[PDB]
Amino acid sequence: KKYYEEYVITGERLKRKKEIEKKLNDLKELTQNYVYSNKEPPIELQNSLKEAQQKYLELY
Amino acid sequence: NKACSFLQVQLSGKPRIIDVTERDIERLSYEISTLEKDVDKVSKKKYNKLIKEFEEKKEQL
């Protein structure tokens, strides 16, 4: 009764990681090369990078 | 027979510097490029060596 529930909690992490591990790897690559010349990935998108990272400053 | 073939390698084509030092452009950058998400600990300090080895190389380059 403990072990399956531990499979739930550790299982629910990786579902929530792949939701966000994909979104980090996409939105950074827009900001990597030549699009960031004049705010075309603006501060709203640059904060959304930091939003999902602050979710995994701790949970990771 | 050995001592002369050492010099043609730098001579026929490119020298010792161009040969050797281009890998420390490439092979070290081959490693850091995969290092995407490293909020983990002390391997952070290896950025602060290997990226500073680029500054060690590219100033000498």
- B-chain CB neighbours of A56 within 8 Å are 37, 39
Q: Which pairs with CB-CB distance under 8 Å and at least 24 residues apart come from A11-17?
A: A13/A59, A16/A59
Give resolution in angstroms.
Answer: 4.2
Provide the sign of the torsion angle of the four alpha carbons A45, B33, B28, B5, taken in this order.
negative
- A-chain CB neighbours of B35 within 8 Å are none
Residues contacting A57, CB < 8 A, separation 6+ = B39
The experimental technique behind this entry is cryo-EM
**CA of A22 to nearest chain B CA: how many angstroms apart?**
12
Provide the sign of the torsion angle of the four alpha carbons A24, A25, A30, A32, taken in this order.
positive
CA distance A23 to A13: 15
Interchain contact, B39 vs A25, CB within 8 Å = no
CA distance A56 to B16: 46
Q: Which of B38, B39, B44 to mutate to test the interface with A (most CBs of A within 10 A)?
A: B39
**CA of B11 to nearest chain A CA: how many angstroms apart?**
39
The answer to whether B45 and B52 are in contact (CB under 8 A) is no
